[PDB]
Amino acid sequence: IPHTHAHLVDAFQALGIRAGQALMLHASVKAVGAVMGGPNVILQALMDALTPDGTLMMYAGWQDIPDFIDSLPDALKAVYLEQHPPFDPATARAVRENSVLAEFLRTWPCVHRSANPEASMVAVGRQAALLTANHALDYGYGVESPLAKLVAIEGYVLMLGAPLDTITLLHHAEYLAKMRHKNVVRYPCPILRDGRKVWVTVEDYDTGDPHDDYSFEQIARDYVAQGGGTRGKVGDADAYLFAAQDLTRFAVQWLESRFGD
Amino acid sequence: MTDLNIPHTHAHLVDAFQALGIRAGQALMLHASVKAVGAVMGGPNVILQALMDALTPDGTLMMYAGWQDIPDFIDSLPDALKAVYLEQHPPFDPATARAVRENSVLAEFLRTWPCVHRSANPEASMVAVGRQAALLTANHALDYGYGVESPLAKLVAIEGYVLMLGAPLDTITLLHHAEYLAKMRHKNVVRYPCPILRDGRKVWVTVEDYDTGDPHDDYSFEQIARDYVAQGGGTRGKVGDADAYLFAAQDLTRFAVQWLESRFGD
Numbered sequence: 001i002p003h004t005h006a007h008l009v010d011a012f013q014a015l016g017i018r019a020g021q022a023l024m025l026h027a028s029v030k031a032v033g034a035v036m037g038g039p040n041v042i043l044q045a046l047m048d049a050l051t052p053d054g055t056l057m058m059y060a061g062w063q064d065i066p067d068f069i070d071s072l073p074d075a076l077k078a079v080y081l082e083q084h085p086p087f088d089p090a091t092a093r094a095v096r097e098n099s100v101l102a103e104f105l106r107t108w109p110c111v112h113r114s115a116n117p118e119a120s121m122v123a124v125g126r127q128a129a130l131l132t133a134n135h136a137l138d139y140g141y142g143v144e145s146p147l148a149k150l151v152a153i154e155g156y157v158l159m160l161g162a163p164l165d166t167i168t169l170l171h172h173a174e175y176l177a178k179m180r181h182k183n184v185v186r187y188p189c190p191i192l193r194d195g196r197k198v199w200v201t202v203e204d205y206d207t208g209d210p211h212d213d214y215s216f217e218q219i220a221r222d223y224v225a226q227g228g229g230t231r232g233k234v235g236d237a238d239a240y241l242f243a244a245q246d247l248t249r250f251a252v253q254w255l256e257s258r259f260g261d
Numbered sequence: 262m263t264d265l266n267i268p269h270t271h272a273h274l275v276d277a278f279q280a281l282g283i284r285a286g287q288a289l290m291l292h293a294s295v296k297a298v299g300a301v302m303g304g305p306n307v308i309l310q311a312l313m314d315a316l317t318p319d320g321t322l323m324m325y326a327g328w329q330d331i332p333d334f335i336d337s338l339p340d341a342l343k344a345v346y347l348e349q350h351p352p353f354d355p356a357t358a359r360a361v362r363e364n365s366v367l368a369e370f371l372r373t374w375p376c377v378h379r380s381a382n383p384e385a386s387m388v389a390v391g392r393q394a395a396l397l398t399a400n401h402a403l404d405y406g407y408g409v410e411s412p413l414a415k416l417v418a419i420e421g422y423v424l425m426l427g428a429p430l431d432t433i434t435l436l437h438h439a440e441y442l443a444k445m446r447h448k449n450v451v452r453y454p455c456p457i458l459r460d461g462r463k464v465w466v467t468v469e470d471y472d473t474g475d476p477h478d479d480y481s482f483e484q485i486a487r488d489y490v491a492q493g494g495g496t497r498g499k500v501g502d503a504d505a506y507l508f509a510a511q512d513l514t515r516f517a518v519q520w521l522e523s524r525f526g527d
């Protein structure tokens with residue numbers, strides 16, 4: 001008895017999903033268990049609960065981003081600079097980890113994808129263009145980003161069996177928080193400009209390691225423990241539903257009270 | 262979005278600990294987030310009381326304390342300021358030194374308990390109550406505080422357990438003992454100053470240890486533990502509102518050492 005479309009819709013609504021919401025999804029397709037019609041039915045079920053007036057977004061990134069070329073032998077780097085393809089939002093594949101549904105969402109009609117290669121987001125639904133447009137290359141989790149806009153339209157984050165450590169929105173809280181010190185990274189990336197490949201330097205806060213003695217798992221568990229969000233079962237997966245505005249405010253205060261200057 | 266609970270009772274915490282697998286006479290190291298458990302009838306001390314009730318007086322309960330105010334950073338200060346720290350900063354006083362800032366409410370509660378014992382190493386300080394509290398905390402060397410002369414080594418040797426109570430597995434102090442034990446291609450060795458009490462007087466000493474602030478290679482503690490649970494390490498169960506985990510110290514240490522050595526070892 002694999003989970004049916006209807007069964008998942010009702011579990012989404014029991015958790016708190018409602019028509020018209022803008023939401024960002026993090027999922028582990030494995031944790032949900034078998035679904036009748038396969039993993040795409042998870043998305044169809046979710047968009048059914050959201051209705052066409054709602055919006056669904058996921059983090060895609062770019063699996064093949066060649067941001068490591070400086071650590072290669074000079075001779076190999078030269079080959080990358082000539083032969084590695086640029087970020088193409090039409091065909092660039094999503095990061096491997098917890099992303100089967102993101103790759104699925106990229107074949108949906110009317111999908112939008114933001115232009116920042118490393119921080120690329122995909123979205124479908126009413127506010128999909130708004131969320132994804134004019135995504136700055138530098139500080140791609142900052143003020144000119146789909147995360148900033150998700151907070152601004154009072155959207156949500158849904159964890160569908162995905163670990164609390166993987167909440168991309170918390171990088172936006174890192175961006176906002178006034179902290180003693182934040183690590184800056186500067187790395188190369190080929191992109192399309194007027195149809196032609198150009199390599200640029202991208203500047204960003206480091207998102208590979210926390211800027212201080214904390215983890216996102218820590219912050220999220222502290223949030224849930226003080227009453228943040230709702231928790232519930234969806235298929236076989238443990239699910240959480242958070243308000244983006246409230247989570248971001250909580251996380252910024254959390255970081256500023258422990259690591260401010 | 263989720264309302265607070267009707268307070269958990271002592272009795273219902275004892276039951277939950279027994280259902281998790283806590284048994285009389287065990288020696289336990291506890292990692293807890295008090296808020297994860299939810300409201301408790303009587304406050305956070307009842308968690309400790311219920312756990313010791315599950316363990317009986319024949320059991321032992323240990324937690325990591327450390328020293329929140331350790332002035333181990335004073336070599337990175339300008340000369341004049343460093344001189345002020347050297348003259349004015351208090352020494353580590355086991356009686357009053359406060360535990361590190363996070364997940365330590367219960368460790369701080371443990372320090373007001375009668376018959377509590379505190380190990381002597383300031384940065385790696387452990388607190389314990391119960392039958393083997395003295396044995397576990399005895400003769401904790403100042404150098405290599407997570408090594409052979411540590412409460413963690415003794416916890417493994419007497420085949421104790423580690424109990425997660427809503428704390429991230431990231432924070433299992435025992436994993437620093439695994440780092441000590443593992444033969445790895447690269448290790449960071451640090452020397453830092455610390456004021457202690459010798460014969461009632463403040464004296465500054467230099468402590469030598471492995472760096473425990475950064476990993477010695479490309480890994481994180483969350484990696485190792487998540488890999489440990491994924492392959493069936495320990496038992497799981499609810500305690501109050503918290504998701505709990507119960508590990509055998511010996512098994513987790515062996516796993517984490519093999520984990521490190523297979524990736525970075527000889």
Ligand SMILES: CN[C@H]1C[C@@H](N)[C@H](O)[C@@H](O[C@@H]2O[C@@H](CO)[C@H](O[C@H]3O[C@@H](CN)[C@@H](O)[C@H](O)[C@@H]3N)[C@H]2O)[C@@H]1O[C@H]1O[C@H](CN)[C@@H](O)[C@H](O)[C@@H]1N
Pocket residue numbers: 209210211212213214331333384451453472473474475476
């Ligand atoms: C041993 N003295 C210093 C030696 C020096 N070589 C270290 O760099 C320095 O560590 C920095 O401070 C850590 C805070 O943990 C950061 O590590 C974190 O960084 C994240 C992401 N980057 C993860 O890598 C990792 O999980 C860590 N949580 C490090 O950048 C040490 O001091 C600290 O560690 C002492 C012992 N525990 C404490 O007593 C001190 O109060 C002080 N916090």
Ligand SMILES: [Cl-]
Pocket residue numbers: 027028029030097098099100101
């Ligand atoms: Cl997945």
Ligand SMILES: [Cl-]
Pocket residue numbers: 024157166167168169170
């Ligand atoms: Cl997110």
Ligand SMILES: [Cl-]
Pocket residue numbers: 293294295296363364365366367
């Ligand atoms: Cl705590």
